[PDB]
Design an enzyme around this catalytic site. Structure first.
Site, mmCIF file in Angstrom:
data_model
loop_
_atom_site.group_PDB
_atom_site.id
_atom_site.type_symbol
_atom_site.label_atom_id
_atom_site.label_comp_id
_atom_site.label_asym_id
_atom_site.label_seq_id
_atom_site.Cartn_x
_atom_site.Cartn_y
_atom_site.Cartn_z
ATOM 1 N N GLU A 11 0.757 -1.206 0.000
ATOM 2 C CA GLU A 11 0.000 0.000 0.000
ATOM 3 C C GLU A 11 0.798 1.271 0.000
ATOM 4 O OE1 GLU A 11 -3.177 -0.032 -0.276
ATOM 5 O OE2 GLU A 11 -3.750 -2.128 0.138
ATOM 6 N N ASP A 20 -6.934 6.897 -4.839
ATOM 7 C CA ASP A 20 -6.563 5.545 -5.023
ATOM 8 C C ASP A 20 -6.596 5.068 -6.426
ATOM 9 O OD1 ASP A 20 -8.934 4.161 -5.217
ATOM 10 O OD2 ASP A 20 -8.637 2.869 -3.466
ATOM 11 N N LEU A 32 -8.704 3.852 3.233
ATOM 12 C CA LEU A 32 -9.711 4.422 2.360
ATOM 13 C C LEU A 32 -10.675 5.344 3.072
ATOM 14 C CD1 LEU A 32 -11.237 4.988 -0.073
ATOM 15 C CD2 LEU A 32 -12.393 2.775 0.202
ATOM 16 N N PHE A 101 -8.186 -6.652 3.561
ATOM 17 C CA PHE A 101 -7.795 -5.293 3.808
ATOM 18 C C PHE A 101 -8.051 -4.470 2.554
ATOM 19 C CE2 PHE A 101 -5.123 -2.235 6.140
ATOM 20 C CZ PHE A 101 -4.767 -1.314 5.160
ATOM 21 N N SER A 114 -12.632 -19.754 -5.608
ATOM 22 C CA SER A 114 -11.245 -19.703 -5.161
ATOM 23 C C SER A 114 -11.134 -20.183 -3.731
ATOM 24 C CB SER A 114 -10.734 -18.267 -5.193
ATOM 25 O OG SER A 114 -10.521 -17.878 -6.513
ATOM 26 N N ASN A 129 -7.421 -19.609 -10.699
ATOM 27 C CA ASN A 129 -8.737 -19.040 -10.557
ATOM 28 C C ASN A 129 -8.644 -17.641 -9.999
ATOM 29 O OD1 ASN A 129 -11.354 -18.819 -8.467
ATOM 30 N ND2 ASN A 129 -11.762 -19.866 -10.432
#
Ligand SMILES: [Cl-]
Ligand SMILES: [Cl-]
EC number: 3.2.1.17
Length: 159
Positions: A11, A20, A32, A101, A114, A129
């Protein structure tokens, strides 16, 4: 290597509001927020002070701590995620937390196929996948990192 170090690499750190990868207002370490004003407002409310849009490193870290804690708890409260998390080894657990996250419990919860693969320890298949997603197409380098982590169960992609 650990979850904190892992996400700090994915990040980055920004002390000034910013947009972002999808254009949302964010700050610190992937925190965020979302309008800049609306974002400034949110920010002020998150920090408890009049920020004018800028935070200290200390402040960014405080948020980051809160956010990692929140991702873990969400996982553990989530009926779709918890069982997957429980079945994983420590490194891969870290990979799941990273996805949460980034995309939220909800977003991850929808990677149904998945997840089943991960739960059944079919490593190679789940990697394939996972790659078939907007997530992968939008932030491919990051995505490749997390996926390698699920596939190998090692921290090699981060080293
Ligand atoms: Cl907050
Ligand atoms: Cl990326």
């Amino acid at each position: 290597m650990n979850i904190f170090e892992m996400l700090r690499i994915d990040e980055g750190l920004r002390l000034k509001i910013y947009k972002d990868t999808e254009g949302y207002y964010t700050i610190g370490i992937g925190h965020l927020l979302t309008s800049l004003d609306a974002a400034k407002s949110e920010l002020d409310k998150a920090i408890g002070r009049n920020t004018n849009g800028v935070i200290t490193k200390d402040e960014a870290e405080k948020l980051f701590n809160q956010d990692v804690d929140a991702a873990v708890r969400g996982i553990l409260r989530n009926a779709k995620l918890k069982p997957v998390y429980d079945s994983l080894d420590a490194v891969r657990r870290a990979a799941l937390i990273n996805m949460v996250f980034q995309m939220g419990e909800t977003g991850v919860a929808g990677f149904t196929n998945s997840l089943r693969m991960l739960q059944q320890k079919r490593w190679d298949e789940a990697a394939v996948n996972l790659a078939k997603s907007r997530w992968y197409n939008q932030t491919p380098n990051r995505a490749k990192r997390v996926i390698t982590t699920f596939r190998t169960g090692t921290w090699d992609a981060y080293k």
